[PDB]
Amino acid sequence: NKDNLRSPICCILGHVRTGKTKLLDKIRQTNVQEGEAGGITQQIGATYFPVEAIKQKTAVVNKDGKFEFKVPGLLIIDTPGHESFSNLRSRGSSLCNIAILVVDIMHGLEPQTIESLRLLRERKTPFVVALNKIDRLYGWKKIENNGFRESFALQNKAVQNEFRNRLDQVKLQFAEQGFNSELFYENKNFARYVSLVPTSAHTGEGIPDMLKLIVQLCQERMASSLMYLSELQATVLEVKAIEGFGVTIDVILSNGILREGDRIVLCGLEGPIKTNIRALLTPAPMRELRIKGQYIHHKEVKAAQGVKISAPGLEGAIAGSRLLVVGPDD
Template structure:
């Protein structure tokens, strides 16, 4: 999957040509389609302007061989949150075993050429996908069987490789748009334009690819765009578009224009675009318009994202290629299933200054001295500084892969900490000596006990509570050397279990049952501030909520601050 956004303009005459076999030469009331290819939901998040959605209708691509994957569900959820209408392109039908290619044919014509086995496999896989959509709370159906458009989402089987189903998809897009979006598709003069990508192009320098949804852009227009280092005020030097049916991201010759009318994807060349932020609005300064006010408006999107970060707290440093990607990543990291705290953010390549900011965590929480770099390059200088300081950099062009890398890193750190602190951790427990449970009264003491509360582990320091003249004192008995049940050794025993334990004095003062303590004394795990911190930091996931409440109860008992 490419991580660059592509855009292709389909003029009406080309759509008529591609759909003529469907006998719909038709009734096209729009001049064409501007199709923007976003590599996943992160890039789709860039398609907005001042909080609104630039996308009129979306095509959700589902691989017929794999069905709804996690990334597909994320995209689906974003479409639902944005209330965006969409059509499902059930792609890669040419991968069905035994598929006979009918290049660029309508899908029903292509299906007529297939064997019984191919049709059978197609129906089976289609049913699987429809079921998966139902599990997400959505009804779907093959578009030519769909009698409830609006209530039920249409599925168009396609092959991006050999073109089957593409005529159907184009015609359905046109028909659906013209039927349901008459008012939305009405052209207005107000410029509505969003920066999709910032690129360096040989012979043109740093350029911005924009999608113009409404209005007109002219050569020489004074524009304001959001920049990572402040607003950028510049003038359009040239307006470039790809040839019809060619993607803007594909290298080739561009068409020059003095002006471009919406809707179109345009490459703009101008001075000073190096720090432009993709995913933000482009503003044209009209006659008499206040430049300072336009600069403030241009920076609003960036400020809203920056304001979400708690710069005083603990957390990782996040770097992404665009504002939309950054917003998607922040949303993911803050989700209930992930919950990774964020202390700093940036847009664009990772530089030395970003490593310095991440390095502030080295003295506080070393695992957060980390840069999560999503779809961005890391400069050589930044890598060298990170290695020198001990800052970790994780790079990926898919959010889930970035999270997986960080999760493995955190798990390894926790395991290392567990090994380092294994001898110091104390799990909470209270034990009651069983009647006739004294097997050996001297060191090492062997007793039969009932675990009244908490969790008993080998290595736990055990003490008893003594009251002397209204003062509470604790007498250490020793450490749990072993736990047995029915002569079988255990690593731990839980609440309600009756077990035999051996208590070793560990070369300390030897205690004796009957002299220093008796059957009425409860045996308590001796916790400390240090052992509580270790338990909370490295072992919290190993104890239940009730067991943690018991720790807090012991904290009061031992008067730990």
């Protein structure tokens, strides 16, 4: 049914300083990356992208306009690239229906790329690879926010030669790791072979191709079930004190529908916590949940979304705990 439609979850994974947060910043038109403490990503980030915005940002690679969008929206998960946060990467990976694996085209596959590849392989998660930082190709000239193929056609042959050498050795690296990969238009076996999207976080080039590709991951590679809403699933990302709201929880609503006044149960230090959802909040669209700002009050939220819950007795709450809704009787 057209209602009960579900927004899938996409996880961005990659080696440290590969441009994950920067790519998200370019799509969002924000500056989270500069703001980050320690100059690193240390927490899971949630941004919701309405399908309209995706249509906007994919216009250059879909100018006839006959490409089909059957998703209501897409929830996007940013993850830490550092070696230390294996656990956060694992959690994010557990949550996400599809993925973008970011590779620095200059460096190729690196240890955390390998780790992420194991994570994706183990949970059989459909993914595309973003060859980021293509502007670092010597003598690259920019057309802002343009499809990769269009701008690549305009490049000189030094740039094309460097690009195809790096592309070749990245393909050989993937082959060594047990993956057959292809440049996204060159791929004839979408099910078995991984599409590669050259991108620039600074220039925004290749991003429309990437967006349209994760969309096609949702429509073709992802299970049909997850196109539609189902029995509720939610996971606690964070526990924090917010003023006017006391101790609140940042939660990923993976499936189902969350409602205001719902009696919920989640896990705390020494045991279960049963309470009622007094306030159901989201960040503004195209904005991170962890980043503070304004909130939108909801009387219900449909999966998948990043939400903030205000409720009594959430002090003990544990991150990574599942969240359940308790029905009125028996």
